[PDB]
Every structure is written in C-alpha cells, then in structure tokens.
Amino acid sequence: VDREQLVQKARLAEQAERYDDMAAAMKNVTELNEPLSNEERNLLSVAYKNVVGARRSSWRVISSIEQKTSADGNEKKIEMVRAYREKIEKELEAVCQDVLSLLDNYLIKNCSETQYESKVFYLKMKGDYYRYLAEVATGEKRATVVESSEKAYSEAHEISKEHMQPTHPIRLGLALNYSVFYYEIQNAPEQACHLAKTAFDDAIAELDTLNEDSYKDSTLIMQLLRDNLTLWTSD
C-alpha cells in the first residue's frame, strides 16, 4: 500500500472510531522513515491517545474497585481484581512502549535543526507517554519513568521557550501537561503553579502574537491553565 492509502485508512478508522486500526495505519506511515506533516502528526497523536486512553480509563475503574474490595476482605475477589488490573497495565505499557519506540527511532530522530514545532510536539508526546507509564508504576520502576518524563518535558520546554511564541498552541499545550506532571506525578504543587502561571502570564503579555487561524486553540489551553491554577490554589 502507498503512503496516501495508509493516511486515508487512518482518516476512515477515525470516523469509524476504530483507533487500533488508525494507530496501526499511522505506525506504518511513521515506519516509512519520511517526516510527518501537521495533519499526519495529529492523526498519529489522536490514534495512540485514544488507544492508551481506553486502558487508562479501564485501569482507573479497576483500581477504584480494588481499593473498595480490599476493605471488605474477599480473598478470591481481590486476587481476580489485582490480576485484571495487571492485565490492563501490561496492555497500557505495551501501547506506551510502541509509541515511545516510534518517537525515539523515527520521529524525534528525523527532526531537522530548524524543525522546532515537530521537535517540541514529539518531546511533549515522549513526556506524556512516560507520564502514562508513571501513573501505573510503583517503586524503582516508577522512579525510572518519572525521570524519563521529566527529561523529555524539560528538553521540549527549553526548545519552545527559545524558538516558539508564548501564545503558540504547542508551547501552551506542553506547559499544561508539564504542570500536570509536576502536580500529579512529582507532587510538586509550587513548581506546577509557577509553570502554569508563567505560561499564562507570558501568553497574556503577548496576546498581540495570537494567530487568526489558531487563536481559538491557544485560548482553549489558556482557559485550562487558569482552571488548573484555580483548582491547585483552592486545594
């Protein structure tokens, strides 16, 4: 199959809500070792976000049941629940490793020196999928993926600050997820609030830089940055 047919299969699967088929198609496109367009980049992101998202949602539901089931003290039930959580965990981890290998061996690798937007987009993705791994990990395994997530976000933040405008949706989007990482994963609310406030204040200072085509996308993230800050400074 030619590249165009694969991109069109991903577009069909998205409409058919068959995200495993969409991810498979976009993985094949990535494996052609040619750079992805803005459309192709988002098709891949949406596909894998929905695939991992299904496991994340299931894991949260099972974990919630596991916490309640542990209280009643039902030996046979607790093990069955624990085992099911582990089954979903393994599925989630496999999806993350699948994404992370595409990012490390194809996507980040093929970014040119001047391709700043793509480099930030993929490093943010790297940060996100290591954060999704952190969400389910414990002990030293958790410490490892948390370190990896920080390294990816930190690199993306340095590039975006240097080459992207504070109002850029990719830059704001990274600041949103990186602040979420600080609060939820690192349990650093002071660092989380500082990052979210700086990103919001810098974008507010240069509202004149908003692009007619992406102003709505930027303001949507800016709202989430304030919503999170309001929440974090209430708690």
Binding site: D128, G173, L176, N177, S179, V180, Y183, E184, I221, L224, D227, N228, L231, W232
Partner: peptide
C-alpha cells in the same frame, strides 16, 4: 482533579 491537553 487537573485536566491535560485533549
């Protein structure tokens, strides 16, 4: 809880 990018 906080929301991440959609």
């Amino acid at each position: 809880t906080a929301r991440s990018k959609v």
